Amino acid sequence: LRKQRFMQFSSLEHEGEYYMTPRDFLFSVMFEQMTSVKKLTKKDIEDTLSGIQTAGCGSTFFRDLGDKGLISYTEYLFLLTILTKPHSGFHVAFKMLDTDGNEMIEKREFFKLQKIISKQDINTTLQMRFFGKRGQRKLHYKEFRRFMENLQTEIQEMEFLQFSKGLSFMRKEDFAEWLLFFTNTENKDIYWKNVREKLSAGESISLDEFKSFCHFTTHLEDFAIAMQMFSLAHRPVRLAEFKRAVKVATGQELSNNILDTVFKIFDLDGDECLSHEEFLGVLKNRMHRGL
Amino acid sequence: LRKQRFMQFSSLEHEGEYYMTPRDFLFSVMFEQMTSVKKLTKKDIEDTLSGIQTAGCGSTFFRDLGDKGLISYTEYLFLLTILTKPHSGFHVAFKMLDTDGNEMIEKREFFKLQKIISKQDINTTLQMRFFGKRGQRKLHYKEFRRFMENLQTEIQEMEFLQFSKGLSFMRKEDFAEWLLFFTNTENKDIYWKNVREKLSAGESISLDEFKSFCHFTTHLEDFAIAMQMFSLAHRPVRLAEFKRAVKVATGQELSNNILDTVFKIFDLDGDECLSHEEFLGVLKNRMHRGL
Structure with missing residues (x-):
């Protein structure tokens, strides 16, 4: 039923085929529901998607385009899979998209994706x-990897400027309210009791902290190993071992205020321990996209 | 009753005296109503406002500080007057704040503002x-002027990223919805009829367009001269003379899509003319701050 969200945030079309803007793509990433679909013939297509090299290939690419872009439903699902993909599956998905084995993805790969769409x-x-x-131009692995990380990083930046409300910093209330976005309302309100009571001022939460935290939240199942080890061993996880587990998982240290605030959040009982079960369950509810 | 908004968005205090963050200042600029006031002694004051030279003195200064700042009610009203001031009154307000005539503002000027507060x-x-x-440090005119324009420009940027929704561009719907913020609901909905019907795709609206437009909206009374000339002469103002009047007023050309979209907005009748009366009346309702 992922076609129905494409039905929702479509704003331009061509020959019965709905399209989107890059902005509608970003709203399908973040926003739930809001526009008027208008028709486009071939001259409109040229006048819109002309000058793609004018956009910079850094980490602001859809903000470099704005509305200058039309996205097929195949490309729509393709970019959603990029947003859901962990870091490890990059070369694997590249070689699965390397049917001709030529260290490249070609246009027939996208046409084979459209063959999948047609067989559906x-x-x-x-x-x-x-x-x-x-x-006529080709596509290698390095551009592909840089494109995926730039896309994910720009999504991180756009959510950061949403919940930070235009600032370069975040508070802990913003971090908690973002973090508890896809939680059920009762546990959310118990967490809001925890916000009102157990959270304090602390300090401002920067950008690289949020970036490392989002990089953590894309590696949850590989993080779940020591979780299930000390779960079936029934060792309630303290913060010091949690530091070691996060460093082994991500490869990058989180700052101590991140870990302190997370420990103030997920300790419902206040018992200096971790309820990892509800943690991982509502966390897997939380990091599921397409919603 | 401007003290009551300071009562609203206060979040820290000291000895019965409410303070704010720079973030609470920015929310008092934009947001209507939302926090919990917490107490601060002198060590908290030092630990918060230490390292002010760490912040860059460009156009992101409160975003360079974030929460690192405490704002008195005198400074609160002072910065609000800076946000309401047109460009012309700069040196006039500087010399009015130059009581000692020494080409400078000193600390006794702020203490005289507090004398005004005390006499209130x-x-x-x-x-x-x-x-x-x-x-012990002094204060000249150039730093003062640069501070005022950086403050106003950063407010422009924060409203731009609010209504643009994180993009580097705006659509015409965003520009109209920002522009019709302090309008009464019936005329707003007639304007929304005008949005749904007479507005089209156009193109993306950039940053410097919005900056020049905000610079226009700070010089409305000096713009009203030719307005009242061709009003008492009863010449309904067309777009070509409007280009000339805007260029004489601001000193900078607006782009044609700005003028086209404004002409699609304020022409209720569609009669290729200007209803300048409701224009200027709801515009003076619109550019009044403190709300």
Whole structure:
């Protein structure tokens, strides 16, 4: 039923085929529900997606485009899978998209994705980004990896500026309210009791802290190993071992205020221990996209 | 009753005297109503406002500080007057704050503002910004002018990223919805009829367009001269003369999509003319701050 969200945030179309803006893509990432679909013929397509090299290929690429972009439903699901993918599966997905074995993804790979779309039953933005105007340009692994990390990082930045409310910093209330976004309302309100009572001022929460935290939340199942080890061993996880587990998982240290605030959040009982069960359950509810 | 908004968005205090963050200042600029006031003794004051030179003196200064700042009610009203001031009154207000005639504002000027506060009946952020830790540093006109324009420009940027929703561009719907913020609901909904019907796609609205437009909206009374000339002459103002009037007023050209979209907004009748009366009346309702 992921077609129905594409039905929701469509705003332009062509020959019965709904499209989106990059902005509608970003709203499908974040916003629940809001527009008017307008029609486009071929001259409109050229005037919109002309000049893709004008956009900078850094970490602001859809903000470099704004509305200048039309996204097929195949590209829509493709970018959603990029947003859901952990770091480890990069070269694996690249070689699965390397059917011809030529260390490359080609335009026939996207046409085979459209073959999948057809079995489930027009020049777009990423076609120009990775293959030029007609597909004559090629696509290697390094551009692919940089594109995936830039996309995820720009999503991190846009959520950061949403919940930080335009500042370069965050408070702990903003971090908790973002972190408890896809939680059920009763546990949310018990957590809000924990916010009102057990959370304090602390200090401002920076950008790289949130970036490392989002990098943590894309590696939850590999983090769950020592969790189930000391779960079936029934060792309630303290903060010092949690530091070691996070460092082994991500490869990067979180700051102590992150760990302190997380420990103030997920300790319902205040018993200096970890209820890892509800932690991991509502966390897997929380890091599921498409919603 | 401007004390009551200071009562609203206060979040820290000292000896019965409510303070704010820079973030609470920015929310008093934009947001209507939302926190918990917590107490601070002198060590808290030092630990908060230490290191003001760490913040960059460009156009992100409160975002460079975040929560690192405590704002007196005198400084609160002072910065609100800076946000309401047109460009022309700069040197005039500087010389009115130059009682000692020494081409400078000194700490006794702020103490005379506090004398005004007392007749209407503790080291703060701007004291360190303009005079150092104890007032021994001085304050000239150039820093004052740069501070006022950086403050106004950062407010422009924060509203831009609010209504643009994190993008580097705006649509015309965002520009209209920002522009019609302090309008009464019936005329607002007639304007929304005008949005749904007469507005089109156009193109993306950039940052410098919004900056020039806000610079226009701080010079409305000097813009009203030719308005009243062709009003008592009863010449309904067309767009071509409006270009000339805006260029004479601001000194900077607006782009044609700005003028086209404004002409699509304020032409209720569609009669290719200007209803300048409701324009200027609800515009003076719109550009009044403190709300």
